[PDB]
Design a protein around this ligand. Sequence first.
Ligand SMILES: CC(=O)N[C@@H]1[C@@H](O)[C@H](O[C@@H]2O[C@H](CO)[C@H](O)[C@H](O)[C@H]2O)[C@@H](CO)O[C@H]1O
Ligand SMILES: [Ca+2]
Length: 232
Amino acid sequence: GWTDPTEFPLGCSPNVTTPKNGLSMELYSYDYLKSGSNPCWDAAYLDPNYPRTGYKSHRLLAKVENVAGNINFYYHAPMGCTSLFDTLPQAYNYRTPLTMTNFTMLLYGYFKPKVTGYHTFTISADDLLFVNFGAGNAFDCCKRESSADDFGNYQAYAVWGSQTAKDDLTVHLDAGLYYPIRIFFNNRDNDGALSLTLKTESDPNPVIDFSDYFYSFDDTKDGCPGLVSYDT
Ligand SMILES: CC(=O)N[C@@H]1[C@@H](O)[C@H](O[C@@H]2O[C@H](CO)[C@H](O)[C@H](O)[C@H]2O)[C@@H](CO)O[C@H]1O
Ligand SMILES: [Ca+2]
């Protein structure tokens, strides 16, 4: 039950006077197979455990903080089956060129709503985007480090070329709470793309700039369970 994704995800109440803006990010290599191979790309990204522990067998490229803003991109590769260096959008706070054609990316932190009510998050990706959302499902309130690998069934998932290449998740959220979120991305080859949008009833248009929504909090000994609750 604890890590299963739900329509009423659990949020958190960190004790934080001055919250740190943006999500944390980790970038890892995703090397091609030997030049001339067909298939040319490493298939590891489809392994159920690649997003849990497999990516750790790859090279750590960087740890980045303060990922905040519009994180969506479409990277158009000039050639397929070819590693090419380019840059991520500004939101990612990572200015140096990386292999945009082939890389793994993990984001985590907390999502703070602006208006209490239903939130629909929509995702699409090339090649892979797996999203967890809520305490337990993503990780435990102010206990991320100790629960980081224990995420549950994805609230949304998108895999290019599969039967689910676009997805969404609809959750009821309270604007006073901060919700654990985990976003796992992979580009295996060629084009790379990530789209996350948010729809609520308070705006007829989607939200694409998450500047005001993404936070990071330090873990604590006792954790920071949500202090707003409506269940009976
Ligand atoms: C040019 C070549 O030798 N092969 C390419 C393939 O590598 C190419 O790759 C796929 O592209 C899709 C997007 O359309 C997606 O990014 C996959 O991750 C990627 O493997 C495929 C389609 O472009 O066929 C040839 O063009
Ligand atoms: Ca791709």
